[PDB]
Amino acid sequence: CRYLLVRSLQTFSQAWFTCRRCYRGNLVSIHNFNINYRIQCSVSALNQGQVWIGGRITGSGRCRRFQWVDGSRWNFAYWAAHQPWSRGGHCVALCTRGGHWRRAHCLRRLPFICSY
Ligand SMILES: [Cl-]
Numbered sequence: 074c075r076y077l078l079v080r081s082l083q084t085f086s087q088a089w090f091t092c093r094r095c096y097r098g099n100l101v102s103i104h105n106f107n108i109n110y111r112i113q114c115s116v117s118a119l120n121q122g123q124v125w126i127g128g129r130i131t132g133s134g135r136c137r138r139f140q141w142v143d144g145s146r147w148n149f150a151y152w153a154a155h156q157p158w159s160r161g162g163h164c165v166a167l168c169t170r171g172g173h174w175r176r177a178h179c180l181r182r183l184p185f186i187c188s189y
Pocket residue numbers: 162163164177178179180
């Protein structure tokens with residue numbers, strides 16, 4: 074899986090369409106632990122504690138159906154302790170320290186990982 078770290082802080086939608094606009098891809102869609110580690114390796118120097126990825130807790134009310142923007146299936150997740158319920162927004166963000174996933178509010182401006 075090819076992935077590119079963009080260091081500019083942008084909202085989720087911004088990042089999503091930024092990946093599509095600049096590199097013709099999407100926000101990274103992680104499907105195993107290897108990619109999660111390599112992506113964790115690429116975000117070991119980021120001061121920002123989190124980075125956006127393609128995850129979406131998209132559910133009408135309380136359906137809370139995790140889904141990737143890229144459309145790929147949702148078969149893997151590396152959730153942090155005390156996650157991912159009763160906290161956070163609708164958009165997922167990978168914690169730079171450790172590599173565990175979080176739930177963040179989409180309007181937050183954080184670095185992101187573009188796939189290509
Ligand atoms: Cl939100």
